[PDB]
């Protein structure tokens, strides 16, 4: 019965809302096919009253439907299927699935004049051609963002990237003129709490037909079998958190639809479609996006590792240049401090320090004091050959490696505090009408929430950045020992 406030919202059970969106009806069955619960609108949408204890009957739901249901009813492992069928006055999409051991049948009115197979195929071809045309991982995102809008007619579609700390960044955008831009927006991990994030990962597509909707409750609330709520995780019609709904209306959005990009076990980022009036996307089309989601995820994965590959390649090429020079010139300092192949170019940094013997070369600033303090901190830890941190002198980020012990051969890279890369301003943008929860649920409030998180922090060191440092360290050890 608990109200969901700003304090609660992190722990909101959004998977068991026990209600569904109004653009469809829902019937929940148990293993034997016996009805356990239904949305309060089954009668109003489909001509009949589903009742707990009942079993579904032909042409109160039609034949092919039970035909489908029986198949999944007798199959081990998460059944999933859909049928198209006429029930009374209308034809329906009857998407059905089984999660836990409860079976779900979802009913959407089908208004499309097209054959489903071809509608599905047509859109799949169109939206994944965008995945064959681009080598830049950012062109991919940018282009499919522009294309998703062309296909769906959404007012605004955005591509989010998710950082290491699960903070988001709007990296692409295609929007109707009128609308303010959110390009370069940054929001915290708390804007998409655990359960919501778990769900985007498990579900390629989420659709919100109308944010201003009144939910259609499924009765009864609790599954008699367990005396605990129905887990609508894989339910297409599952209802929305009032918090998110308030957020979206603060923005002035009325319909959403998001396509996930999952790589590893991580939500790599999603495409969020927003409409200013309510909007619906037919089932077969959503399936076009679902399959797309899986392929795009695959290509983004490769494109990303193709990116790291090239980073490693030019790094070694520079380690080669470095090895070449060092042996022939015989001062390392000159080699390391080289303007372009220098260490400052090896790994993205705002500065670097080279330190062998008693001599100190600070390149791109005065870093001698910091390096001294960092080194003192490592006093307590004589065995550390590598040190790094984004919390901390005057530079937040530090990556230090040791290549000579006795003569204190050290290398440092430094990073300043992370800064909002792109920022809007210039003319006060319009007044958002703000709900009861407060300004926290506006983009402006989200950004501020993000600042408070990152400030005091430099950008984390790449998986890649550390790998390079490690290779460099090996190089110099070799050199110093060798000659």
Ligand X SMILES: */C=C/C1=C(C)C(=O)N/C1=C\C1=NC(=C\c2[nH]c(/C=C3\NC(=O)C(C=C)=C3C)c(C)c2CCC(=O)O)/C(CCC(=O)O)=C1C
Query: Which spans of this chain sit near ligand X (rule: CB under 6 A)?
Result: 9-10, 14, 182, 185, 187, 190-193, 196, 206, 240-241, 243-244, 247, 256, 258, 272, 441, 443, 446
Rounded to an integer, what is the distance from CA 285 to the centroid of its chain? 22
Residue 9 marked ligand-binding: yes
CB of 92 to ligand X, least distance (A): 24
Residues with their C more than 2.5 Å from the N of the next written residue in the chain, i.e. before a break, are 392
- Helix 137-152 / helix 116-128 crossing angle, nearest 10 deg: 150
CB of 142 to ligand X, least distance (A): 17
CB of 48 to ligand X, least distance (A): 29
Question: Residue 48 or residue 447: which is nearer to ligand X going by CB?
Answer: 447
Q: Find out whether the peptide bond into 220 is cis, omega within 30 degrees of 0.
A: yes
CB of 451 to ligand X, least distance (A): 13
Helices (H) and strands (E) in the chain, counts: 12, 20
Question: Residue 172 or residue 468: which is nearer to ligand X going by CB?
Answer: 172
Q: Cα–Cα distance between 228 and 225 in angstroms, integer?
A: 8
Nearest residue to 267 via CA among 353, 203, 331, 320: 203
Question: Residue 119 or residue 256: which is nearer to ligand X going by CB?
Answer: 256
CB of 125 to ligand X, least distance (A): 26
215 in Cβ contact with 19 (< 8 Å): yes
Q: Cα–Cα distance between 112 and 133 in angstroms, integer?
A: 30
Q: Cα–Cα distance between 215 and 219 in angstroms, integer?
A: 12
Tokens for 287? 């399936």
Q: Cα–Cα distance between 50 and 52 in angstroms, integer?
A: 7
Q: Quick one: residue 53, left, alpha or beta (phi over 0 = left, psi -120 to 50 = alpha)? A: left
Residue 478's SS3 state is helix
Question: Residue 15 or residue 318: which is nearer to ligand X going by CB?
Answer: 15
Q: Cα–Cα distance between 330 and 444 in angstroms, integer?
A: 55
Question: Residue 232 or residue 336: which is nearer to ligand X going by CB?
Answer: 232
Look at the block and give the residue holding tokens 């599905």. Answer: 120
Question: Residue 110 or residue 274: which is nearer to ligand X going by CB?
Answer: 274
470 in Cβ contact with 317 (< 8 Å): no
CB of 182 to ligand X, least distance (A): 5
CB of 127 to ligand X, least distance (A): 19
CB of 14 to ligand X, least distance (A): 5
39 in Cβ contact with 217 (< 8 Å): yes
Nearest residue to 164 via CA among 186, 199, 136, 189: 189
Question: Residue 41 or residue 241: which is nearer to ligand X going by CB?
Answer: 241
Q: How many CB atoms lie within 10 A of CB 160?
A: 22
Question: Residue 175 or residue 415: which is nearer to ligand X going by CB?
Answer: 175
9 in Cβ contact with 438 (< 8 Å): no
Residue list, annotated binding site: 9
Residue list, annotated binding site for a tetrapyrrole: 9
């Amino acid at each position: 019965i608990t109200p969901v406030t700003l304090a609660n919202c992190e722990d909101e059970p959004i998977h068991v809302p026990g209600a569904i969106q109004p653009h469809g009806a829902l019937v929940t069955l148990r293993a034997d096919g016996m009805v356990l619960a239904a949305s309060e609108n089954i009668q109003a949408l489909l001509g009949f009253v589903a009742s707990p204890g009942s079993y579904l009957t032909q042409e109160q739901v039609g034949p092919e439907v039970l035909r489908m249901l029986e198949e999944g009813l007798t199959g081990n492992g998460p059944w999933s299927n859909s049928v198209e069928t006429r029930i009374g006055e209308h034809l329906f999409d009857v998407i059905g699935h089984s999660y836990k051991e409860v079976f779900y049948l979802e009913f959407e009115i089908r208004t499309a004049d097209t054959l489903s197979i071809t509608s599905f195929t047509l859109n799949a071809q169109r939206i994944i051609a965008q995945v064959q045309l681009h080598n830049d991982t950012a062109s991919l995102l940018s282009n499919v963002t522009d294309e998703l809008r062309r296909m769906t007619g959404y007012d605004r579609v955005m591509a989010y990237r998710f950082r290491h700390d699960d903070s988001g960044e709007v990296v692409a955008e295609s929007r109707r003129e009128d609308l303010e831009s959110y390009l370069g927006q940054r929001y915290p991990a708390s804007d998409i709490p655990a359960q919501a994030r778990r769900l985007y990962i498990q579900n390629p597509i989420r659709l919100i037909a109308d944010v201003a909707y009144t939910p259609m409750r499924v009765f009864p609330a609790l599954n008699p079998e367990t005396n605990e709520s129905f887990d609508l995780s894989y339910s297409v019609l599952r209802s929305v958190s009032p918090i998110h709904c308030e957020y979206l209306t603060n923005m002035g959005v009325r319909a959403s639809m998001s396509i996930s990009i999952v790589v590893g076990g991580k939500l790599w980022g999603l495409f969020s479609c927003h409409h200013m009036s309510p909007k619906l996307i037919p089932y077969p089309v959503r399936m076009s996006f679902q399959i797309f989601s899986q392929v795009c995820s695959a290509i983004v994965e490769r494109l990303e590792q193709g990116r790291i590959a090239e980073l490693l390649r030019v790094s070694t090429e520079r380690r080669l240049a470095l090895a070449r020079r060092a042996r022939d010139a015989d001062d390392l300092f000159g080699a390391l401090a080289h303007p372009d192949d220098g260490i400052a170019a090896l790994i993205p940094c705002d500065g670097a320090l080279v330190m062998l013997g008693g001599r100190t070369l600070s390149i791109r600033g005065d870093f001698e004091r910091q390096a001294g303090n960092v080194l003192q901190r490592l006093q307590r830890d004589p065995e550390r050959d590598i040190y790094h941190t984004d919390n901390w002198g005057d530079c937040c980020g530090v990556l230090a490696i040791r290549f000579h012990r006795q003569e204190s051969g050290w290398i440092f890279w430094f990073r300043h505090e992370e800064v909002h890369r792109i920022r809007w301003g210039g003319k006060p943008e319009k007044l958002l009408t703000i709900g009861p929860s407060g300004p926290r649920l506006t983009p402006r409030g989200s950004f501020e929430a993000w600042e408070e998180v990152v400030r005091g922090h430099s950008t984390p060191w790449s998986e890649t950045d550390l790998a390079i440092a490690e290779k460099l360290r090996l190089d110099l050890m070799e050199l110093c020992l060798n000659h």
